[PDB]
Amino acid sequence: GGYLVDPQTSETIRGVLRSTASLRQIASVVNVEATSFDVLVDKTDMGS
Amino acid sequence: GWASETAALSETATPQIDRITIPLHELAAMPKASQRLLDDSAFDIETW
């Protein structure tokens, strides 16, 4: 009399929601197809 | 034979046959390359 009443499962298995603030939103991403990426900066300025 | 004119030519030899088998082996090489290298290494490493 209990083999007749199987329960009902949810439609999708749900998970704990984790934050998605990544610092990728404010930083700059660059599409690079190579082993690495270099940047060229100026640690000093000119003279007048 | 150097057959004569009236000689009643008899049987002559026949070349015998030898069969030589060439087992046709195989020769295997298995180099391992990193997938990171094959994408970052502008020289075609596949064909190299």
mmCIF file of N, CA and C in Angstrom:
data_model
loop_
_atom_site.group_PDB
_atom_site.id
_atom_site.type_symbol
_atom_site.label_atom_id
_atom_site.label_comp_id
_atom_site.label_asym_id
_atom_site.label_seq_id
_atom_site.Cartn_x
_atom_site.Cartn_y
_atom_site.Cartn_z
ATOM 1 N N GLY A 1 0.832 -1.217 0.000
ATOM 2 C CA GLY A 1 0.000 0.000 0.000
ATOM 3 C C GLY A 1 0.858 1.255 0.000
ATOM 4 N N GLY A 2 2.183 1.098 -0.069
ATOM 5 C CA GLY A 2 3.097 2.257 -0.056
ATOM 6 C C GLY A 2 4.001 2.258 -1.271
ATOM 7 N N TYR A 3 4.022 1.141 -2.001
ATOM 8 C CA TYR A 3 4.648 1.072 -3.312
ATOM 9 C C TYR A 3 3.907 1.877 -4.355
ATOM 10 N N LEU A 4 2.854 2.583 -3.969
ATOM 11 C CA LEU A 4 1.970 3.258 -4.904
ATOM 12 C C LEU A 4 2.161 4.768 -4.912
ATOM 13 N N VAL A 5 2.998 5.306 -4.026
ATOM 14 C CA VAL A 5 2.967 6.726 -3.699
ATOM 15 C C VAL A 5 4.324 7.405 -3.818
ATOM 16 N N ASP A 6 5.155 6.972 -4.759
ATOM 17 C CA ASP A 6 6.481 7.557 -4.947
ATOM 18 C C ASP A 6 6.467 9.085 -4.913
ATOM 19 N N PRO A 7 7.482 9.718 -4.316
ATOM 20 C CA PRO A 7 7.472 11.182 -4.197
ATOM 21 C C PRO A 7 7.677 11.905 -5.514
ATOM 22 N N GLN A 8 7.698 13.231 -5.461
ATOM 23 C CA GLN A 8 7.865 14.072 -6.635
ATOM 24 C C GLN A 8 9.145 14.882 -6.504
ATOM 25 N N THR A 9 10.030 14.757 -7.481
ATOM 26 C CA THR A 9 11.311 15.440 -7.456
ATOM 27 C C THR A 9 11.226 16.764 -8.200
ATOM 28 N N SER A 10 12.169 17.649 -7.898
ATOM 29 C CA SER A 10 12.202 18.949 -8.542
ATOM 30 C C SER A 10 12.617 18.815 -10.003
ATOM 31 N N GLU A 11 12.293 19.844 -10.785
ATOM 32 C CA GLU A 11 12.528 19.783 -12.225
ATOM 33 C C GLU A 11 14.012 19.873 -12.550
ATOM 34 N N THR A 12 14.759 20.664 -11.787
ATOM 35 C CA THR A 12 16.193 20.800 -11.977
ATOM 36 C C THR A 12 16.861 20.787 -10.617
ATOM 37 N N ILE A 13 18.082 20.266 -10.562
ATOM 38 C CA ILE A 13 18.804 20.274 -9.301
ATOM 39 C C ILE A 13 19.421 21.647 -9.098
ATOM 40 N N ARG A 14 19.124 22.254 -7.958
ATOM 41 C CA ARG A 14 19.501 23.629 -7.697
ATOM 42 C C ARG A 14 20.722 23.666 -6.796
ATOM 43 N N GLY A 15 21.396 24.811 -6.797
ATOM 44 C CA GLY A 15 22.606 24.962 -6.026
ATOM 45 C C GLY A 15 22.626 26.278 -5.278
ATOM 46 N N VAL A 16 23.632 26.406 -4.418
ATOM 47 C CA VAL A 16 23.806 27.627 -3.652
ATOM 48 C C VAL A 16 24.276 28.735 -4.579
ATOM 49 N N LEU A 17 23.659 29.903 -4.455
ATOM 50 C CA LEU A 17 24.015 31.044 -5.281
ATOM 51 C C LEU A 17 25.252 31.720 -4.718
ATOM 52 N N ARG A 18 26.271 31.876 -5.551
ATOM 53 C CA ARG A 18 27.503 32.520 -5.136
ATOM 54 C C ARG A 18 27.706 33.801 -5.927
ATOM 55 N N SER A 19 28.372 34.761 -5.295
ATOM 56 C CA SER A 19 28.502 36.082 -5.884
ATOM 57 C C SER A 19 29.299 36.010 -7.173
ATOM 58 N N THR A 20 28.984 36.916 -8.095
ATOM 59 C CA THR A 20 29.621 36.938 -9.404
ATOM 60 C C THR A 20 30.362 38.240 -9.672
ATOM 61 N N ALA A 21 30.680 39.007 -8.634
ATOM 62 C CA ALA A 21 31.514 40.190 -8.801
ATOM 63 C C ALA A 21 32.958 39.734 -8.910
ATOM 64 N N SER A 22 33.598 40.056 -10.028
ATOM 65 C CA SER A 22 34.807 39.361 -10.428
ATOM 66 C C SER A 22 36.046 40.223 -10.561
ATOM 67 N N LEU A 23 35.924 41.546 -10.551
ATOM 68 C CA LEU A 23 36.997 42.485 -10.866
ATOM 69 C C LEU A 23 37.356 42.395 -12.335
ATOM 70 N N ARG A 24 36.749 41.477 -13.068
ATOM 71 C CA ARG A 24 36.825 41.469 -14.512
ATOM 72 C C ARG A 24 35.946 42.546 -15.105
ATOM 73 N N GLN A 25 34.962 43.016 -14.338
ATOM 74 C CA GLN A 25 34.058 44.048 -14.818
ATOM 75 C C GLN A 25 34.750 45.392 -14.918
ATOM 76 N N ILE A 26 35.709 45.660 -14.038
ATOM 77 C CA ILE A 26 36.372 46.956 -14.026
ATOM 78 C C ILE A 26 37.760 46.879 -14.651
ATOM 79 N N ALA A 27 38.430 45.740 -14.526
ATOM 80 C CA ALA A 27 39.726 45.609 -15.165
ATOM 81 C C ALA A 27 39.559 45.508 -16.676
ATOM 82 N N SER A 28 40.683 45.548 -17.381
ATOM 83 C CA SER A 28 40.692 45.478 -18.835
ATOM 84 C C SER A 28 41.123 44.087 -19.271
ATOM 85 N N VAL A 29 40.295 43.432 -20.061
ATOM 86 C CA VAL A 29 40.637 42.138 -20.627
ATOM 87 C C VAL A 29 41.112 42.366 -22.048
ATOM 88 N N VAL A 30 42.048 41.537 -22.488
ATOM 89 C CA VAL A 30 42.604 41.634 -23.829
ATOM 90 C C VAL A 30 42.637 40.241 -24.434
ATOM 91 N N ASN A 31 42.173 40.125 -25.671
ATOM 92 C CA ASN A 31 42.163 38.846 -26.369
ATOM 93 C C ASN A 31 43.557 38.591 -26.914
ATOM 94 N N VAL A 32 44.243 37.601 -26.360
ATOM 95 C CA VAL A 32 45.607 37.294 -26.760
ATOM 96 C C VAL A 32 45.704 35.810 -27.074
ATOM 97 N N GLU A 33 46.286 35.488 -28.225
ATOM 98 C CA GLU A 33 46.537 34.111 -28.639
ATOM 99 C C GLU A 33 48.048 33.936 -28.695
ATOM 100 N N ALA A 34 48.649 33.665 -27.548
ATOM 101 C CA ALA A 34 50.095 33.522 -27.431
ATOM 102 C C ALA A 34 50.384 32.981 -26.042
ATOM 103 N N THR A 35 51.658 32.728 -25.770
ATOM 104 C CA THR A 35 52.017 32.153 -24.485
ATOM 105 C C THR A 35 51.906 33.150 -23.359
ATOM 106 N N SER A 36 51.803 34.430 -23.675
ATOM 107 C CA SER A 36 51.934 35.464 -22.665
ATOM 108 C C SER A 36 51.556 36.795 -23.283
ATOM 109 N N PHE A 37 51.495 37.813 -22.439
ATOM 110 C CA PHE A 37 51.192 39.164 -22.875
ATOM 111 C C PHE A 37 52.159 40.113 -22.199
ATOM 112 N N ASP A 38 52.713 41.037 -22.968
ATOM 113 C CA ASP A 38 53.623 42.032 -22.436
ATOM 114 C C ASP A 38 52.986 43.400 -22.582
ATOM 115 N N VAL A 39 53.292 44.288 -21.657
ATOM 116 C CA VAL A 39 52.879 45.675 -21.785
ATOM 117 C C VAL A 39 54.136 46.516 -21.719
ATOM 118 N N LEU A 40 54.096 47.672 -22.365
ATOM 119 C CA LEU A 40 55.225 48.585 -22.370
ATOM 120 C C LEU A 40 54.789 49.878 -21.706
ATOM 121 N N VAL A 41 55.448 50.233 -20.608
ATOM 122 C CA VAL A 41 55.017 51.367 -19.806
ATOM 123 C C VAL A 41 56.128 52.409 -19.787
ATOM 124 N N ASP A 42 55.894 53.531 -19.111
ATOM 125 C CA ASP A 42 56.896 54.577 -18.927
ATOM 126 C C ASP A 42 57.008 54.827 -17.429
ATOM 127 N N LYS A 43 58.073 54.330 -16.817
ATOM 128 C CA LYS A 43 58.253 54.554 -15.394
ATOM 129 C C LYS A 43 58.852 55.917 -15.073
ATOM 130 N N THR A 44 59.239 56.694 -16.081
ATOM 131 C CA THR A 44 59.788 58.029 -15.895
ATOM 132 C C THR A 44 59.215 58.915 -16.994
ATOM 133 N N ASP A 45 59.479 60.215 -16.927
ATOM 134 C CA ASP A 45 59.035 61.133 -17.970
ATOM 135 C C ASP A 45 60.237 61.893 -18.523
ATOM 136 N N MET A 46 59.962 62.821 -19.427
ATOM 137 C CA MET A 46 61.007 63.512 -20.165
ATOM 138 C C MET A 46 61.641 64.596 -19.308
ATOM 139 N N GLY A 47 62.442 65.437 -19.947
ATOM 140 C CA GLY A 47 62.985 66.611 -19.300
ATOM 141 C C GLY A 47 62.822 67.816 -20.201
ATOM 142 N N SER A 48 62.629 68.967 -19.571
ATOM 143 C CA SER A 48 62.466 70.231 -20.266
ATOM 144 C C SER A 48 63.584 71.170 -19.854
ATOM 145 N N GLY B 1 70.897 -26.968 -75.904
ATOM 146 C CA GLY B 1 71.336 -28.199 -76.517
ATOM 147 C C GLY B 1 72.391 -28.147 -77.599
ATOM 148 N N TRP B 2 72.415 -27.081 -78.390
ATOM 149 C CA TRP B 2 73.144 -27.084 -79.651
ATOM 150 C C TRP B 2 72.689 -28.287 -80.467
ATOM 151 N N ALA B 3 71.386 -28.310 -80.727
ATOM 152 C CA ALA B 3 70.755 -29.470 -81.333
ATOM 153 C C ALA B 3 71.377 -29.776 -82.684
ATOM 154 N N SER B 4 71.491 -31.062 -82.986
ATOM 155 C CA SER B 4 71.994 -31.499 -84.277
ATOM 156 C C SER B 4 70.842 -31.534 -85.274
ATOM 157 N N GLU B 5 71.111 -32.043 -86.470
ATOM 158 C CA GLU B 5 70.072 -32.115 -87.486
ATOM 159 C C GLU B 5 69.149 -33.296 -87.246
ATOM 160 N N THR B 6 69.716 -34.441 -86.877
ATOM 161 C CA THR B 6 68.975 -35.678 -86.647
ATOM 162 C C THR B 6 69.423 -36.202 -85.290
ATOM 163 N N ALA B 7 68.774 -35.741 -84.225
ATOM 164 C CA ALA B 7 69.225 -36.055 -82.877
ATOM 165 C C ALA B 7 68.127 -36.490 -81.922
ATOM 166 N N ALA B 8 66.854 -36.280 -82.251
ATOM 167 C CA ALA B 8 65.745 -36.615 -81.360
ATOM 168 C C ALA B 8 65.899 -35.891 -80.024
ATOM 169 N N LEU B 9 65.727 -34.574 -80.081
ATOM 170 C CA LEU B 9 65.903 -33.702 -78.927
ATOM 171 C C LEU B 9 65.100 -34.184 -77.729
ATOM 172 N N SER B 10 65.784 -34.349 -76.602
ATOM 173 C CA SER B 10 65.178 -34.840 -75.375
ATOM 174 C C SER B 10 64.892 -33.673 -74.433
ATOM 175 N N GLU B 11 64.464 -33.986 -73.213
ATOM 176 C CA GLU B 11 64.107 -32.956 -72.252
ATOM 177 C C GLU B 11 65.317 -32.128 -71.856
ATOM 178 N N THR B 12 65.062 -30.865 -71.545
ATOM 179 C CA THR B 12 66.077 -29.969 -71.024
ATOM 180 C C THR B 12 65.640 -29.465 -69.659
ATOM 181 N N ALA B 13 66.596 -28.885 -68.940
ATOM 182 C CA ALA B 13 66.356 -28.432 -67.584
ATOM 183 C C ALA B 13 65.344 -27.292 -67.568
ATOM 184 N N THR B 14 64.955 -26.901 -66.359
ATOM 185 C CA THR B 14 63.948 -25.896 -66.144
ATOM 186 C C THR B 14 64.420 -25.140 -64.907
ATOM 187 N N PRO B 15 64.350 -23.810 -64.899
ATOM 188 C CA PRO B 15 64.870 -23.066 -63.750
ATOM 189 C C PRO B 15 63.962 -23.256 -62.548
ATOM 190 N N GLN B 16 64.564 -23.525 -61.396
ATOM 191 C CA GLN B 16 63.736 -23.671 -60.215
ATOM 192 C C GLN B 16 63.512 -22.318 -59.559
ATOM 193 N N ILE B 17 62.482 -22.263 -58.727
ATOM 194 C CA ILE B 17 61.945 -21.014 -58.218
ATOM 195 C C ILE B 17 62.054 -20.992 -56.703
ATOM 196 N N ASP B 18 62.496 -19.861 -56.165
ATOM 197 C CA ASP B 18 62.551 -19.638 -54.730
ATOM 198 C C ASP B 18 61.737 -18.398 -54.406
ATOM 199 N N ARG B 19 60.923 -18.488 -53.362
ATOM 200 C CA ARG B 19 60.084 -17.389 -52.912
ATOM 201 C C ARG B 19 60.623 -16.870 -51.593
ATOM 202 N N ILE B 20 60.787 -15.555 -51.498
ATOM 203 C CA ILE B 20 61.361 -14.903 -50.330
ATOM 204 C C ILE B 20 60.299 -13.997 -49.735
ATOM 205 N N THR B 21 60.052 -14.132 -48.436
ATOM 206 C CA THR B 21 58.989 -13.375 -47.788
ATOM 207 C C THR B 21 59.583 -12.143 -47.118
ATOM 208 N N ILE B 22 58.851 -11.038 -47.194
ATOM 209 C CA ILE B 22 59.272 -9.767 -46.615
ATOM 210 C C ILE B 22 58.247 -9.394 -45.547
ATOM 211 N N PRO B 23 58.465 -9.742 -44.281
ATOM 212 C CA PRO B 23 57.365 -9.660 -43.310
ATOM 213 C C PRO B 23 56.747 -8.281 -43.148
ATOM 214 N N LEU B 24 57.381 -7.210 -43.625
ATOM 215 C CA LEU B 24 56.786 -5.869 -43.614
ATOM 216 C C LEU B 24 56.370 -5.439 -42.202
ATOM 217 N N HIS B 25 57.378 -5.243 -41.357
ATOM 218 C CA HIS B 25 57.147 -4.806 -39.989
ATOM 219 C C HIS B 25 56.731 -3.339 -39.971
ATOM 220 N N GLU B 26 56.567 -2.791 -38.771
ATOM 221 C CA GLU B 26 56.212 -1.389 -38.613
ATOM 222 C C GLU B 26 57.157 -0.708 -37.635
ATOM 223 N N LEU B 27 57.142 0.619 -37.678
ATOM 224 C CA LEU B 27 58.108 1.447 -36.963
ATOM 225 C C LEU B 27 57.332 2.587 -36.328
ATOM 226 N N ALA B 28 57.328 2.657 -35.001
ATOM 227 C CA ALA B 28 56.432 3.548 -34.280
ATOM 228 C C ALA B 28 57.187 4.606 -33.489
ATOM 229 N N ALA B 29 56.692 5.838 -33.554
ATOM 230 C CA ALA B 29 57.180 6.938 -32.739
ATOM 231 C C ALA B 29 55.986 7.614 -32.093
ATOM 232 N N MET B 30 56.113 7.960 -30.816
ATOM 233 C CA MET B 30 55.034 8.590 -30.060
ATOM 234 C C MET B 30 55.595 9.754 -29.260
ATOM 235 N N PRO B 31 55.716 10.927 -29.869
ATOM 236 C CA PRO B 31 56.125 12.109 -29.116
ATOM 237 C C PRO B 31 54.933 12.750 -28.430
ATOM 238 N N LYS B 32 55.213 13.442 -27.333
ATOM 239 C CA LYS B 32 54.173 14.077 -26.534
ATOM 240 C C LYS B 32 54.409 15.574 -26.506
ATOM 241 N N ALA B 33 53.414 16.337 -26.929
ATOM 242 C CA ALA B 33 53.480 17.783 -26.903
ATOM 243 C C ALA B 33 52.370 18.320 -26.016
ATOM 244 N N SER B 34 52.639 19.434 -25.351
ATOM 245 C CA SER B 34 51.635 20.045 -24.500
ATOM 246 C C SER B 34 50.651 20.832 -25.346
ATOM 247 N N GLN B 35 49.372 20.750 -24.987
ATOM 248 C CA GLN B 35 48.355 21.457 -25.751
ATOM 249 C C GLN B 35 48.538 22.960 -25.648
ATOM 250 N N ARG B 36 49.096 23.431 -24.535
ATOM 251 C CA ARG B 36 49.390 24.848 -24.397
ATOM 252 C C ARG B 36 50.428 25.297 -25.410
ATOM 253 N N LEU B 37 51.393 24.438 -25.724
ATOM 254 C CA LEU B 37 52.418 24.803 -26.694
ATOM 255 C C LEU B 37 51.853 24.856 -28.103
ATOM 256 N N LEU B 38 50.968 23.925 -28.447
ATOM 257 C CA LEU B 38 50.480 23.851 -29.815
ATOM 258 C C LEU B 38 49.607 25.039 -30.184
ATOM 259 N N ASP B 39 49.200 25.848 -29.211
ATOM 260 C CA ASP B 39 48.385 27.020 -29.486
ATOM 261 C C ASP B 39 49.167 28.321 -29.433
ATOM 262 N N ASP B 40 50.368 28.313 -28.859
ATOM 263 C CA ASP B 40 51.052 29.538 -28.476
ATOM 264 C C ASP B 40 52.388 29.707 -29.183
ATOM 265 N N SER B 41 52.646 28.937 -30.234
ATOM 266 C CA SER B 41 54.006 28.669 -30.698
ATOM 267 C C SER B 41 54.094 28.768 -32.215
ATOM 268 N N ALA B 42 53.829 29.950 -32.769
ATOM 269 C CA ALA B 42 53.414 30.157 -34.157
ATOM 270 C C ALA B 42 53.981 29.192 -35.197
ATOM 271 N N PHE B 43 55.156 28.620 -34.960
ATOM 272 C CA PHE B 43 55.621 27.534 -35.812
ATOM 273 C C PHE B 43 54.627 26.388 -35.780
ATOM 274 N N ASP B 44 54.258 25.881 -36.947
ATOM 275 C CA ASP B 44 53.330 24.758 -36.964
ATOM 276 C C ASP B 44 54.027 23.567 -36.328
ATOM 277 N N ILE B 45 53.678 23.273 -35.076
ATOM 278 C CA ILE B 45 54.302 22.148 -34.393
ATOM 279 C C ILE B 45 53.680 20.838 -34.835
ATOM 280 N N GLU B 46 52.406 20.856 -35.218
ATOM 281 C CA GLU B 46 51.786 19.661 -35.770
ATOM 282 C C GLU B 46 52.607 19.115 -36.927
ATOM 283 N N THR B 47 52.871 19.947 -37.935
ATOM 284 C CA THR B 47 53.582 19.478 -39.115
ATOM 285 C C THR B 47 55.078 19.365 -38.893
ATOM 286 N N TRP B 48 55.618 19.999 -37.858
ATOM 287 C CA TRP B 48 57.048 19.875 -37.632
ATOM 288 C C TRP B 48 57.386 18.516 -37.044
#
